[PDB]
Each structure stands twice: as C-alpha cells, then as structure tokens.
Design a protein around this motif. Structure first.
Motif, PDB file in Angstrom:
ATOM      1  N   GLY A 162       0.770  -1.227   0.000  1.00 50.44           N
ATOM      2  CA  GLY A 162       0.000   0.000   0.000  1.00 50.44           C
ATOM      3  C   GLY A 162       0.806   1.285   0.000  1.00 50.44           C
ATOM      4  N   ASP A 163       2.084   1.230  -0.372  1.00 49.86           N
ATOM      5  CA  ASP A 163       2.882   2.460  -0.389  1.00 49.86           C
ATOM      6  C   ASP A 163       2.692   3.258  -1.686  1.00 49.86           C
ATOM      7  OD1 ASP A 163       4.605   1.232  -2.264  1.00 49.86           O
ATOM      8  OD2 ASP A 163       6.191   0.846  -0.806  1.00 49.86           O
ATOM      9  N   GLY A 164       1.983   2.657  -2.639  1.00 45.23           N
ATOM     10  CA  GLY A 164       1.653   3.312  -3.900  1.00 45.23           C
ATOM     11  C   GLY A 164       2.823   3.703  -4.794  1.00 45.23           C
ATOM     12  N   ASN A 168       5.046   1.212  -6.239  1.00 45.35           N
ATOM     13  CA  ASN A 168       5.310   0.157  -7.221  1.00 45.35           C
ATOM     14  C   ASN A 168       6.815  -0.083  -7.453  1.00 45.35           C
ATOM     15  OD1 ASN A 168       4.342  -1.821  -9.171  1.00 45.35           O
ATOM     16  ND2 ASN A 168       5.038  -0.379 -10.754  1.00 45.35           N
ATOM     17  N   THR A 169       7.473  -0.648  -6.452  1.00 39.20           N
ATOM     18  CA  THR A 169       8.898  -0.950  -6.526  1.00 39.20           C
ATOM     19  C   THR A 169       9.141  -2.398  -6.946  1.00 39.20           C
ATOM     20  OG1 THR A 169       8.904  -1.543  -4.167  1.00 39.20           O
ATOM     21  CG2 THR A 169       9.518   0.726  -4.742  1.00 39.20           C
ATOM     22  N   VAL A 170      10.403  -2.737  -7.211  1.00 45.23           N
ATOM     23  CA  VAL A 170      10.818  -4.143  -7.271  1.00 45.23           C
ATOM     24  C   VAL A 170      10.493  -4.793  -5.922  1.00 45.23           C
ATOM     25  CG1 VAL A 170      12.609  -3.854  -9.014  1.00 45.23           C
ATOM     26  CG2 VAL A 170      13.136  -3.426  -6.586  1.00 45.23           C
ATOM     27  N   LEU A 213       8.128   4.399   1.258  1.00 42.36           N
ATOM     28  CA  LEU A 213       8.230   2.948   1.069  1.00 42.36           C
ATOM     29  C   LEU A 213       7.927   2.161   2.335  1.00 42.36           C
ATOM     30  CD1 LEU A 213      11.325   2.281  -1.187  1.00 42.36           C
ATOM     31  CD2 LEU A 213       9.005   2.904  -1.814  1.00 42.36           C
ATOM     32  N   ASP A 214       7.299   1.000   2.168  1.00 41.53           N
ATOM     33  CA  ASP A 214       7.169   0.073   3.290  1.00 41.53           C
ATOM     34  C   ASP A 214       8.380  -0.858   3.344  1.00 41.53           C
ATOM     35  OD1 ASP A 214       6.455  -1.532   1.040  1.00 41.53           O
ATOM     36  OD2 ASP A 214       5.138  -2.786   2.272  1.00 41.53           O
ATOM     37  N   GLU A 215       9.569  -0.259   3.222  1.00 44.72           N
ATOM     38  CA  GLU A 215      10.837  -0.986   3.261  1.00 44.72           C
ATOM     39  C   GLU A 215      11.880  -0.039   3.821  1.00 44.72           C
ATOM     40  OE1 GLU A 215       8.699  -3.642   0.529  1.00 44.72           O
ATOM     41  OE2 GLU A 215      10.563  -4.064   1.638  1.00 44.72           O
ATOM     42  N   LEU A 216      13.061  -0.553   4.137  1.00 47.95           N
ATOM     43  CA  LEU A 216      14.199   0.323   4.343  1.00 47.95           C
ATOM     44  C   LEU A 216      14.562   0.844   2.963  1.00 47.95           C
ATOM     45  CD1 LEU A 216      16.195  -1.828   6.886  1.00 47.95           C
ATOM     46  CD2 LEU A 216      15.320   0.470   7.293  1.00 47.95           C
TER      47      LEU A 216
HETATM   48 MG   LIG Z   1       7.113  -2.766  -0.575  1.00 45.64          MG
END
Ligand SMILES: [Mg+2]
Ligand SMILES: O=P(O)(O)OC[C@H]1O[C@H](OP(=O)(O)OP(=O)(O)O)[C@H](O)[C@@H]1O
Ligand SMILES: O=P(O)(O)OC[C@H]1O[C@H](OP(=O)(O)OP(=O)(O)O)[C@H](O)[C@@H]1O
Ligand SMILES: Cc1ccc(C(=O)O)c(Nc2c(C)cccc2C(=O)O)c1
Ligand SMILES: Cc1ccc(C(=O)O)c(Nc2c(C)cccc2C(=O)O)c1
Ligand SMILES: [Mg+2]
Ligand SMILES: [Mg+2]
Ligand SMILES: [Mg+2]
Lengths: 346, 346
Positions: free
Chosen positions: A87-89, A91-93, A227-230
């Motif tokens: 849901g971070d909108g 669109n990453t790898v 991002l929902d990542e580091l």
């Molecule tokens: Mg993600």
C-alpha cells in the motif's frame, strides 16, 4: 453481551473498545457471521477512532486462532519474517522477497508471509510465481521447505481462508483501513523475529506495539520517501522492538557507505520484469536494486540477532551487511533460489 | 472523476468533502449503484469526520430530487412541518404528531413528514394508523387532504422509495449516523417553515444550517433533558433559523408560566396506548402531556409567524400559546382529527 450496535456505537463515539470487543468483532467476521455492512462499518470506525495496539493485537490474535498452523516443532525458535503491509503506492521491485532469499541463504531460517499485489503491479507472491517457486503449499510442505531449503513461504489466502469474508468489503471500500496492518501481524508460523514494512507512518508505532506485546524482536520500518521498506533514497524511520519495548529511530544508509538512489531506480514492472530484477541481483549485478536488497536483508539479520539480549546495534548492522553481501557474492542466494524451485517441482 | 475510494479516503483523512461529492455519493446510493459496504463506509466515515451543513444539505437535496413531489400549486407557501429525527431513546407520547393536529386546527396549513418508529414503541405514523388516519396516501391524495382537512401526512417510505437501498444497511449498523439527520430535512412537499426536533445536540446546528441555506423559517429544537422536542421538564436549546441566518437560544417555558414536569409524565407505550393519549389531550384532559403538546404547537406557530420578517419573538410565543390552547378548548382539534379520519374513509 457484545453486539454490533454496542461496538460500532462505542467506536463512532471516539472511544477505545473494552477488552475482548475487537476480538469478538473479528471472530464474527471470520466465522462468516457478519454482514458486509457491519464489516465495513467496523473497519472504517476503527480506522477513524485511531486503533490501539491492544485492539490491533486482538484482531490479529483472532486471525491466528482461525489460521492453519504449521505442524508441531517444525518452526525454528529463531525463524524470521520479511514482509510489509504494501500500500505504499510506489510500485517498486520486490524488496522484501529478494531480501528474504538473501537472508535464508545467509543461514537465517525464513518463514515468510506473503500475498499477491493489492495495488502494485506485481507483489511478492506474483514475482515468486514468475520465478517458478510454488507459492501455495500447505502447512506440512511449508514446514518441509523450511527444513530442506531454509525458507518457506506461507501464502496468506492459503493459510487464512476465513479472512475471505472481509475480502470483497475491503476491495469495495477501496481505501486502507486498520485491516491493512494485519498482513505482517498474522504470519501463521508465528516467527519471533522480523523485518516488517509499514506504509502508514502514523500506524507503524501501533504495529510495533503489537509485536512488543508478543515479545518479538522486530524492526518496523517506514521509508521517509513512503516505502514500506528500508529505503536507499533517503532516511527511514525504524520502530525497534526488543525486550517487550519499542524505541523509535531514524536510520541513514549513508552511514554504512550506501550512495543515495533515486526512487525511479527502484521502480518495478510486471511479474516478468520483477522476476528478471531478482535474477539480476542474485546473479551479482551491482547498482541501486542490489543496495536496497542488501540493506533490507541486513535489517532482517539484525532483527534475528536481537533475539539475544547481548546483541548490539552497530556491530549487528555491520555483520548483517557483511553476511547479506557475502550470501549474494558467493552465489549462495542464487543457488538457494534454484534449490527452492527444484524443491517445489519434486 | 468521483469514486468511492476518493470520497472515503478524503473522509477517513478527516477532511471535508469537495462541493458535489456528498451529492454524488447519495445519488449513487439512491440509484441502487452502491454496494452495501460502500453505503456503510460512507455513513460511518461522514459521521466521524463531523458532517458540515453543506454536506448534509447535499444529501437531503439528492433525496428530494428522487422523491415523489406533490402536484404543482397544491402546497401553500406558508405550510409548516412538525417532525423530529427521533432517536432520543426516551420513548415519549407522540408530541410532534399531537402538536401537528393542534397547529392545523388553529388554521396553520400543516404538511407533516412522518414515519413509523425506529427505536421507540410507537412512532408518529404508527399512532396515526391506530387512530384511523390513513398513512398510505400518495401525492394527489395528500394534496387533497391538505386542502380539505387542513393537514396532509407524507409517509416517508411512500414518498422516498429510492431510499430503500440504504434501509438494510442502516438497520445492520444499528447506530445513528449522518443519515439520521435527514428525515426532517426531506419533507417532499418542501414546506418553508417547521418545528424540527433533533435528538443529537451537537448536530442540531448542522441541521439548522441546512434550513438556513433554504431560507426556511424553522426552530430546530433539543430539550436539555434529551428530547427531540420542546420539553417541559427543563430548558430547551433552540437554533432559530430566520433570514438565512442561525441564532442559538436557551428557552425556558417557565417564562410563559409552565410547571416543571418529570420525564416519566411524558412517557409513552404501544400504538393503542399512544392513540389513547392523543384522544385524551384532544378531549381536553389537563396535565403534563397537554402542556407539552401546547408548548410544541406554539413553537410551530412561532416558526410559521417567522415567515414574515416583521414578527417579534415574545409576542409570537404568547400568540402561539393562545391559539394552541384555544384550538384544543373549542374542540377544533378534536373535530379536525375526526374529519381527517372521515376523509380517509371517503
Ligand atoms: Mg514494498
Ligand atoms: O500491492 P501492494 O499493496 O502495494 O503490496 C505490495 C506487496 O507488498 C506486500 O508483500 P511483501 O512485502 O512480501 O512484497 P515485496 O517483496 O514486494 O516487498 C504485499 O503482500 C504485496 O505482495
Ligand atoms: O423511534 P424513534 O427513532 O425514537 O422515533 C420516534 C418518532 O419520531 C419521529 O417522528 P415524529 O417527530 O413525527 O414523531 P412524534 O409524533 O412521536 O414526535 C420518527 O419518525 C418516529 O416516528
Ligand atoms: C501477507 C499480507 C500482506 C498484506 C495483506 C493486506 O491485505 O494488507 C494481507 N492480507 C490478507 C491476509 C492477511 C490473509 C488472507 C488474505 C489477505 C488478502 O488481503 O488477500 C496479507
Ligand atoms: C420522517 C422520518 C424521520 C426520521 C427518519 C430516519 O431515518 O431517521 C426517516 N427516514 C426515512 C426517510 C426520510 C424516507 C424513507 C424512509 C425512512 C426510514 O428510515 O424508514 C424519516
Ligand atoms: Mg515489502
Ligand atoms: Mg417528534
Ligand atoms: Mg420525539
């Protein structure tokens, strides 16, 4: 005696629920006893009230009660998850999925909770599917994958079939609610460690509170770019969960020698495109995507290290980075993926 | 281009909607194009955000567009409504309905919006039905009732068939939402004056704002004991709508010589019990119920007077009280009810 009017009335009055009420509500949903209107009203009201860690913990607790469990004594005490809310909108790898493969290759047991995309082009499960990995194995075979390959993948719809009643409702509403916190909180193997992404800056502390209640060792992470990542494009906020306590930190990869990337350098595509990116990173390609994978892998390794009270922050990160980088460079990560594919075929 | 995710997302972010968004939503609902989950999400989200008068006016406006209208030139420019939201949880005798009969008998044209009970034992329509009054008349016959008897009753489900799409959802949620403000705001005859009860103290100003936008002459009333009527047990708050503007007043019936009453004295029962209470008051029985009926009738007469800017507050009330009391004492109110019953039987 709980009822929808009692609970919905309490929430619309901007009051925290009494203990057990959120659980009652979630159990009504999971047993197929709630009307779509009640599911939607509860989801929205809880969201706008501002859910507490106690409440979210009740919801996740009920899901885990209804989930298919893994067989007894098949999950190592130190298994880790690498997964986010999505849901971070952006669109990453597939950074969590790539990190998970690297983490497993480094020797940390990984039991990953995963799912297809909800709004991105290709989610973790979609990309694994494109790579030839069997994503929908049941409990016995996930346990076996974990023992034999070093990684198992729990496909959310496979393990949480009763959550389907809430499915159309959440799609019909079409905006995030408290339910969008539940994916990383409901891994059916119940690992005690994890690198957990949260797309929602203002709810990450609540997710961290739920993990703290379970005494997990987790880093709840939100990139300051969304991002929902580091992330590698800027700093990330980390809610560090250790010894039942939460500590808020800001993390800067430049402190470990990482160059700043642009968000478009991490951009994803369809499942074929994202699978090709996985192959490129595992094959040793240098650049922004690799850096982001190594960073997130190191994060999961730090969460795993935190299962011991003696672990220290900077040495843990330096070790995590060393191990993640070496897992790729030696070809261990590439070989683990090939072995994972062969496992599913055999 | 408006969509449910756009509107619900705005509301869950605690933002007022853009102009026209509430109308789009309500029209989707009334045309049968909204999923139950969407109806429920919208109802709850609007409620918790805190609806504005613009927004509520948009919802009511859409209902009025889809309502069956009365025939052209059949409703006097000075017609008055007496109706409340209900939902005060006190289960009184039917004060608005009794007041309406008395008001009509005093010679003020009344076209009343009404409905059965939602949470009480007997609503206005239930009690009228028990009295022998027809609550099933369509537009032509209501117009005829108005001209021939001096009062018309618009039964809300008969005039708002398209509101059925939200009926199940509102029952399933089982608590009040923004939709519970709409009854008094959607009289299909569109009277310009009214005595309007609101059970929800913190939203009465919003209802008053909708009436101000229409330039109605309305008293929106909330008894400080919780009644959606002018009370006799204590003070009432009045939001006085005149010349497109709203003024908030504290009203005390003791200034006109009323004896303080107790809420138990205004208590109701089933339809037959409430019908008996109407017959008693119209037959001249003195006591708390009559006092509250007279007070509310006078309030409706005051709203009616307000249609001219040359009307003055305290004299208006004295005249309203005089006329209301005389309408009962001469038997005019009793005869009108008898005539109304007769009209329906043809
Ligand atoms: Mg993600
Ligand atoms: O479509 P979205 O709502 O944006 O979700 C993107 C993905 O992120 C979550 O998984 P995970 O973190 O495991 O996937 P990753 O490997 O892509 O990070 C989610 O299950 C999706 O697979
Ligand atoms: O069941 P509740 O939600 O409490 O509502 C009680 C009644 O109040 C409203 O009407 P109205 O003001 O016309 O009725 P009255 O004559 O009883 O005042 C509503 O349409 C119900 O008939
Ligand atoms: C792994 C994961 C991640 C996010 C989500 C989310 O919807 O936010 C998620 N949701 C689901 C869970 C936990 C179980 C079963 C199905 C789903 C789903 O939404 O498809 C599952
Ligand atoms: C007259 C009146 C009063 C209150 C309400 C309320 O729902 O709160 C009400 N609602 C309805 C309207 C406006 C039209 C058609 C049906 C209803 C209903 O709720 O039954 C109608
Ligand atoms: Mg992720
Ligand atoms: Mg009333
Ligand atoms: Mg009332």
């Amino acid at each position: 005696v709980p009822s929808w009017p009692q609970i919905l009335g309490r929430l619309t009055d901007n009051r925290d629920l009494a203990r057990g009420q959120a659980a009652w509500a979630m159990d009504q949903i999971m047993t197929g006893n709630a009307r779509p209107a009640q599911i939607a009203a509860f989801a929205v009201a809880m969201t706008m009230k501002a859910p507490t860690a106690d409440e979210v913990g009740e919801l996740a607790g009920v899901m885990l009660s209804h989930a298919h469990p893994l067989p007894a004594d098949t999950v190592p005490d130190d298994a880790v998850d690498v997964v986010g809310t999505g849901g971070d909108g952006v669109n990453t790898v597939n950074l969590s999925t790539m990190a998970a493969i690297v983490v497993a290759a480094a020797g940390v047991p990984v039991v990953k909770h995963g799912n297809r995309a909800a709004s991105s082009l290709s989610g973790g499960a979609d990309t694994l599917e494109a790579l030839g990995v069997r994503i929908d194995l049941g409990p016995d075979l996930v346990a076996r994958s974990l023992a034999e390959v070093g990684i198992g993948f729990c496909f959310a719809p496979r393990f949480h079939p009763s959550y389907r009643h809430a499915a159309a409702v959440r799609r019909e509403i079409g905006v995030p609610t408290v339910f969008n916190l539940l994916g990383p909180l409901t891994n059916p193997a119940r690992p005690r460690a994890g690198l957990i992404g949260c797309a929602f800056a203002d709810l990450a502390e609540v997710m961290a509170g739920v993990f703290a209640a379970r005494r997990s060792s987790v880093l709840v992470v939100h990139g300051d770019d969304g991002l929902d990542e580091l992330t590698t494009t800027t700093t990330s906020t980390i809610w560090r969960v250790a010894a039942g306590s939460v500590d808020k930190l800001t993390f800067d990869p430049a402190g470990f020698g990482f160059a700043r990337a642009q968000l478009d350098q991490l951009a994803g595509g369809d499942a074929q495109a994202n699978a090709a990116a996985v192959r490129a990173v595992l094959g040793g390609a240098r650049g922004p995507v690799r850096d982001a994978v190594v960073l997130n892998a190191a994060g999961a390794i730090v969460a795993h290290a935190g299962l011991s009270s003696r672990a220290e922050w900077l040495p843990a990160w330096e070790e995590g980075l060393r191990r993640a980088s070496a897992a790729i460079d030696t070809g261990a990560a590439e070989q683990l993926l090939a072995r994972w594919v062969r496992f599913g075929r055999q």
